[model samples]
Target: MIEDPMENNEIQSVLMNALSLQEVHVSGDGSHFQVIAVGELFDGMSRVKKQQTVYGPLMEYIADNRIHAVSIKAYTPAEWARDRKLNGFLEHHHHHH
Candidate 1:
C-alpha cells in the first residue's frame, strides 16, 4: 500500500500536544483507533462537547483518510479514578486498612 500506516504513539502524541490532557492512550489497527483521554477540560462538558474536543486535533488526519475511524472515551481526572476503581474491583476492594 502506498499510504503510510498510522501509529498509536503518533495519535497519542498529537492529542497530548493539542489538548490539556493528563493522560492519553491510543490503540487499534492502523486505520481505526480507540482514544482514551483524561483531563480537567471534560469535567463539566457535554458528551458531544467532549467528543468534539477529542476529535478536533485529529480532524486533519481523519480528513486525509489516514485515520478511518476513532472511538473516544473522555474523562476528567476524578472520573477516570472512579472508573478505574470500579472496573478493577479486586484491586480497589481493600478498605479499612
Candidate 2:
C-alpha cells in the first residue's frame, strides 16, 4: 500500500470506494494504509471475512492492473475506537516495517 506522490485525499478516495469506509487514514506513501468503517454490512461476519471484504476490491485491481499492493486493516467504528490512538499508531507503524 505504498504509493509515492499520493496524498491522503487521493488514497482516501480509493479506500472509500473499496470499502465504503466510515473513516480512513492513508499515509504519505500509498503503500501504507489504515481504515475504520461502520455498517450493518459487517454484522455476522468473521475477522477473516471482514478482511476479505476489504481485500476483495483490491484483489480485483491486482487481478487486472499493476497496483503494487494494498495492505488493509479494516475495522468497525467501535473496533477502531476501542483504543483509538493505539489502533491508529499500529496502522502506520505496521506499515513502516
Maximum-lDDT candidate: 1
Each prediction's whole-model lDDT (CA): 0.65, 0.57
Q: Native-vs-model 1 lDDT?
A: 0.65
What are the models' TM-scores?
Answer: 0.55, 0.49
Across residues 34-53, which tens digit of lDDT does each residue of candidate 1 receive? 67687666777887877786
lDDT value, candidate 2, whole model: 0.57
Q: Please list all clashing residue pairs in model 1, or write none if there are none.
A: none
Residue 75, candidate 1: C-alpha displacement in angstroms: 1.5
For 1-97, candidate 2 gives per-residue lDDT tens digits of 7767744564456567777645664432455344445554664578798778766775665454344444455656666556365755545456553
* Pairs of colliding residues, candidate 2: 1-30, 1-31, 1-32, 2-30, 2-31, 3-30, 3-31
Which candidate has the highest TM-score of all? 1
